[PDB]
């Protein structure tokens, strides 16, 4: 259950190694990669940033509570994120870099699972 990483108390950093791991962020809500190798802190870290993603997506944790990421490529692919600082449904480019929990086919799925569709 290595969603329950994703869902624990941020790794805490480290100044000793020069090693760096992924984790997920709670406070912007995407998995990011920081320097340290396990020097206190939460559960919350991974081997790479997609190890992170795909545990933070089996994560029970609804994709309404997490913030909008399209990544940041080139790709022009239209797909449907939920805005948690205006709470509404808005189509963005999909640059085709990885992504979050937070990412939806259609304005309805991204509604409906803010409403709480499981």
Same mark, same amino acid.
């Given at each position: 259950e290595s969603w329950v990483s994703c869902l624990d108390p941020e790794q805490v950093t480290c100044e000793s190694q020069e090693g760096?791991? #992924?984790?997920?962020?709670?406070?912007t &809500?995407? =998995?990011? +990669?920081?320097? &340290?190798?396990e020097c206190g802190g &939460?559960?919350?870290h991974f081997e790479?940033?997609?190890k992170c993603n795909e545990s933070c997506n089996d994560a029970p944790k609804p994709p309404c509570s997490l913030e909008v990421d399209y990544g940041v490529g080139r790709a022009n692919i239209p797909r449907w994120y939920y805005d948690t600082?205006? #709470?509404?449904?808005?189509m963005f480019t999909y640059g085709g870099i990885t992504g979050n929990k937070n990412?939806?086919?259609? +304005? +309805?799925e991204c509604? +409906?699972? =803010?409403? &709480?569709?499981s």
């Open positions: 760096t791991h #992924a984790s997920y962020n709670r406070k &809500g995407q =998995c990011e +990669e920081q320097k &340290g190798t &939460g559960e919350n790479t940033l997609l600082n205006n #709470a509404t449904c808005e990412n939806f086919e259609s +304005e +309805e509604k +409906e699972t =803010c409403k &709480g569709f």
